[PDB]
Amino acid sequence: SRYSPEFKDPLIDKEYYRKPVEELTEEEKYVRELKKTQLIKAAPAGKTSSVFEDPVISKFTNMMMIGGNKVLARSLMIQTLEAVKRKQFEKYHAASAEEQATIERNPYTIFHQALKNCEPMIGLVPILKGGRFYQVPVPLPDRRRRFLAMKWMITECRDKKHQRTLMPEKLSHKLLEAFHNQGPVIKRKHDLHKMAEANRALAHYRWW
Amino acid sequence: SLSEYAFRMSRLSARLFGEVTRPTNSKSMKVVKLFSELPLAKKKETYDWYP
Amino acid sequence: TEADMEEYIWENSSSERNILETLLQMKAAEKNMEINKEELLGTKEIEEYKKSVVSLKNEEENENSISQYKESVKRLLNVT
Amino acid sequence: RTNENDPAKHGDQHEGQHYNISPQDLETVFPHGLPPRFVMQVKTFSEACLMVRKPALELLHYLKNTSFAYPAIRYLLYGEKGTGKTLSLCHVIHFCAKQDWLILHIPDAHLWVKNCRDLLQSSYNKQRFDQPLEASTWLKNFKTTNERFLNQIKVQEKYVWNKRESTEKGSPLGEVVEQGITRVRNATDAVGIVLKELKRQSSLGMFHLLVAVDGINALWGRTTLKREDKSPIAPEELALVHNLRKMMKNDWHGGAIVSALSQTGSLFKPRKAYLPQELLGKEGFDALDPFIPILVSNYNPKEFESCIQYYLENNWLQHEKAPTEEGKKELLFLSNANPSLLERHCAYL
Amino acid sequence: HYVDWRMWRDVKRRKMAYEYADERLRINSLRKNTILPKILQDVADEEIAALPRDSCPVRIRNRCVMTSRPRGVKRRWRLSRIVFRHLADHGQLSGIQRATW
RNA sequence: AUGAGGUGGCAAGAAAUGGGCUACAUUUUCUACCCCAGAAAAACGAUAGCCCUUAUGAAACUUAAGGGUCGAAGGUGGAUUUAGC
Ligand SMILES: Nc1ncnc2c1ncn2[C@@H]1O[C@H](COP(=O)(O)OP(=O)(O)OP(=O)(O)O)[C@@H](O)[C@H]1O
Ligand SMILES: Nc1nc2c(ncn2[C@@H]2O[C@H](COP(=O)(O)OP(=O)(O)O)[C@@H](O)[C@H]2O)c(=O)[nH]1
Ligand SMILES: [K+]
Ligand SMILES: [Mg+2]
Ligand SMILES: [Mg+2]
Ligand SMILES: [Mg+2]
Ligand SMILES: [Mg+2]
Ligand SMILES: [Mg+2]
Ligand SMILES: [Mg+2]
Structure with missing residues (x-):
């Protein structure tokens, strides 16, 4: 790491710096005064103050990247969002006013909710008691849950079952299915939950 | 291929600058390149290799 | 040959022939045969047009040059 | 958004406002x-x-x-x-x-x-070479566009299709178009005949012609088509391109040759080339000269605001921060008021 | 008094190649053009083949001038990697220092 | 002569195994450009095979490059295993 340990990651948030001084607790004021004399890492080329920035979508693009092709990954992400928005607009126009109130057209909300639905609540981990490892069920922290949801989405889209179907359309269709609580990704989440329940009897094998 | 004026001007420039005047192919330009440089055997770095 | 020149010469050029033919057609449509090659090419409009065309062909082509050429051609073609 | 939908009345008063089709x-x-x-x-x-x-x-x-x-x-x-x-x-x-x-x-x-x-x-x-697929597609589109005048326009020559089949003077141009569309092998010839007939009849006052060609710079440029001998083919060898070149001359009257340059889709042209000479080349500029170049520039602030408002009224900008002034400024900066970039960004924003 | 018989052979090869360089140059020039008659080119081919084998420059092997090593020789100094490292490490080659960057 | 010199010659594949390259494609292939395009898509896939030419050389079927021709195995790989903060 070319950054010495004294370097701190920058905090890129306009509101944080525009917060009124009177609204700062003593600890917050101390933190600001301390940061006034701390070296800061240069802002990475991925995140900015843009109001349209979305960390979840940025991480999804990074996970979808292959061999440093950020341009292509971002292109696929934006194409997927555009396809989702177009499909939702088509459904909204073709649908009656009664259900138009519920039909969602925000692709970012659709994506967030699809990933949230795909998130697994409990995972299977090898735990060892006496010298033998067993696939004991275990809670999954939030980072692991989000990562598993995103990775399942990406892998299911990357499967070879969908032939001559471009990743934009594949991912848009899968995201819509997940948003409506269906599709292979939710099926995989349910399979994980079913296996965890089947091995429920081994919970005590966990020590932590 | 080339305009006649441009071709004649190129031949004139070749004559003035001493290059090959006649039309010749890359195979036969090997003679010119051979004689324009010392043979590898004649180069001092070769025949004077060992003290 | 024209290809063997680094300076663009408007005289006896394709642009000159085209503009001359356009002017001849316009005057024929007007049905007034008070025209000639020298008579047409002597007018100041043709001078500005050849200036602009020569500028475009020889000097670097930019928005200012294109606008000058557009104005000259509009004046020549009597469309504004 | 203008109540005016007639394409003849709108003027500077409607500048920066929308027009429906x-x-x-x-x-x-x-x-x-x-x-x-x-x-x-x-x-x-x-x-x-x-x-x-x-x-x-x-x-x-x-x-x-x-x-x-x-x-x-x-x-x-x-x-x-x-x-x-x-x-x-x-x-x-x-x-x-x-x-x-x-x-x-x-x-x-x-x-x-x-x-x-x-x-x-x-x-x-x-x-010369034929492009039957493109010729037939364009003939279908041309028939759809100008069916109304297609029966009212008659031919003024004899056009042989096969060693036996032919179309006679006085026949509707619809016959030519139908022959081209149905017999795909005659599509290029039908296109050529249609172009010739329209060019000649525009001079007789039968109607007013608008030759609207997009990407006109392709005619006098290069091509990425290779003969069976892996030999490159220049545009003139293509029957369609040659006929369109003939059409692009101002020797005729009773119409206007409107055209638009387009670097996108061009061959052997750099990305940033947009000027008339840069895109047309010596041959193209010589052919088109004299011509009136019209500059299409990025949106001025009024046009940018109008387009953003149009998208917002359509609810296209689904992002919650898009309506904000900060979001508008971000869009303006990212697209530099470029219509295509702004539309592409709003397509997913 | 060379390091070994292989170095001696290479020295002889270099001497003979230097002696026959001009004749080989002229004959190869005759052979390496499409202008002259192919019969003349064929007789030139048989002549160049009839010249002694050791006169051929390709047979010269670049060996270290101090240990007759046939490989790992730096052409610039004509020293094998081992001898060059010895001298450089002891600091007897001007301007050569260990690389660290 | 276990020394020296000359000519010619082997340096291959029954087969196994290690490392690397190319791939099995749609985040892909061809083209233009170097990133706002058009086509391809059961085709993708050899840097292998065979023929020709060129480069070096005195010597090239046995080296390299290019072209032509062919369009092969394969369809993301078992336990196991390598690397990366
Ligand atoms: N006058 C306009 N009114 C509405 N939208 C427009 C206008 N001009 C451009 N656009 C928008 O930009 C896109 C069309 O761009 P257009 O094809 O006109 O650009 P161009 O420069 O002609 O294209 P090219 O890149 O081929 O040169 C669409 O998204 C369209 O909505
Ligand atoms: N098949 C066919 N095509 C014709 C005929 N007349 C014109 N065309 C079309 O138009 C082209 C000929 O145009 P023409 O005015 O004769 O000029 P030319 O191309 O210079 O001979 C042909 O290549 C066809 O595409 C005709 O009688 N038969
Ligand atoms: K593998
Ligand atoms: Mg366009
Ligand atoms: Mg050697
Ligand atoms: Mg012995
Ligand atoms: Mg091959
Ligand atoms: Mg040879
Ligand atoms: Mg193939």
Whole structure:
């Protein structure tokens, strides 16, 4: 790491710096005064103050990247969002006013909710008691849950079952299915939950 | 291929600058390149290799 | 040959022939045969047009040059 | 958004405001040539609204003040990539169609000089090549666009199709179009005959012709088509390109040759080339000269605000921060007011 | 008094190649053009083949001038890697220092 | 002569195994450009095979490059295993 340990990651948030001084607790004021004399890492080329920035979508693009092709990954992400928005607009126009109130057209909300639905609540981990490892069920922290949801989405889209179907359309269709609580990704989440329940009897094998 | 004026001007420039005047192919330009440089055997770095 | 020149010469050029033919057609449509090659090419409009065309062909082509050429051609073609 | 939908009354008063195209007019005038992304937007929104801009207004002014007696004038819309050349040309095409002109609309001349699977040899001139697929597609589109005048226009020669089949003087041009469409082997010849007939009859006052060619720079450029001997083919060897070149001359009258440059889809041209000479080359500029170049520039702030408001009214900008002034400034910076970039960004924003 | 018989052979090869360089140059020039008659080119081919084998420059092997090593020789100094490292490490080659960057 | 010199010659594959390259494609293939395009898509896939030419050389079927021709195995790989903060 070319950054010495004294370097701190920058905090890129306009509101944080525009917060009124009177609204700062003593600890917050101390933190600001301390940061006034701390070296800061240069802002990475991925995140900015843009109001349209979305960390979840940025991480999804990074996970979808292959061999440093950020341009292509971002292109696929934006194409997927555009396809989702177009499909939702088509459904909204073709649908009656009664259900138009519920039909969602925000692709970012659709994506967030699809990933949230795909998130697994409990995972299977090898735990060892006496010298033998067993696939004991275990809670999954939030980072692991989000990562598993995103990775399942990406892998299911990357499967070879969908032939001559471009990743934009594949991912848009899968995201819509997940948003409506269906599709292979939710099926995989349910399979994980079913296996965890089947091995429920081994919970005590966990020590932590 | 080339305009006649441009071709004649190129031949004139070749004559003035001493290059090959006649039309010749890359195979036969090997003679010119051979004689324009010392043979590898004649180069001092070769025949004077060992003290 | 024209290809063997680094300076663009408007005289006896394709642009000159085209503009001359356009002017001849316009005057024929007007049905007034008070025209000639020298008579047409002597007018100041043709001078500005050849200036602009020569500028475009020889000097670097930019928005200012294109606008000058557009104005000259509009004046020549009597469309504004 | 303007209540005005007639393409002849709108002027500087409507500058920076929208102008609608009815579904019937979109299906009739524009069966081809509209930008693919604008077509997607039209399908999504169910509406076809074009912002009225100074380039289209000026070209409409010229076309309204045109003197059909004078030789047909060449107008060339040039500008940076995605500045709106194609849509300004489409606006003028709609105006002329509503004014009842015969619209000879080439949607993208680039397609004719690249990616051609079927490249036969012309039977009318063995030194030229045919592009039956493109010829038939364009003939279908032309029939759809100008069916009304297609039966009213008669031919003025004898046109042999096979060693036995032929079309006779006095036959409708609909016969030529139908022959070309149905017999795909005669599509290029039908296109050539149609171009010749329209060019000759425009001089007789039978109607007013609008030759609206997008990507005109493709005709006098290079091509990525190789003969069976892996030999490159210049544009003139293509029967379609040669006929369109003939059409592009101002020797005739009773119409206007409107065209738009387009670096996108061009061959052997750098990305940042947008100027007339840079895109046309010596041959193309010589052929088109004299011509009136019209600059299509990025949106001025008023036009940018109008387009953003249009998207917001359509609810396209689904991002919660898009309506904010900060979001608008971010969009303006990212797109630099470029219409294509702004539309692309809003497509997913 | 060379390091070994292989170095001696290479020295002889270099001497003979230097002696026959001009004749070989002229004959090869005759052979290496499409202008002259192919019969003349064929007789030139048989002549160049009839010249002694050791006169052929390709047979010269670049060996270290101090240990007759046939490989790992730096052409610039004509020293094998081992001898060059010895001298450089002891600091007897001007300007050569260990690389660290 | 276990020394020296000359000519010619082997340096291959029954087969196994280690490392690397190319791939099995749609985040892909061809083209233009170097990133706002058009086509391809059961085709993708050899840097292998065979023929020709060129480069070096005195010597090239046995070296390299290019072209032509062919369009092969394969369809993301078992336990196991390598590397990366
Ligand atoms: N006058 C306009 N009114 C409405 N939208 C427009 C206008 N001009 C451009 N656009 C938008 O930009 C896109 C069309 O761009 P257009 O094809 O006109 O650009 P261009 O520069 O002609 O294209 P190219 O990149 O081929 O040169 C669509 O998204 C469309 O909505
Ligand atoms: N098949 C056919 N095509 C024709 C005929 N007349 C014109 N064309 C078309 O138009 C072209 C000939 O145009 P023409 O005005 O004769 O000029 P030319 O191309 O210079 O001979 C042909 O290549 C066809 O595409 C005709 O009688 N038969
Ligand atoms: K493998
Ligand atoms: Mg365009
Ligand atoms: Mg050697
Ligand atoms: Mg012995
Ligand atoms: Mg091969
Ligand atoms: Mg040879
Ligand atoms: Mg193949």
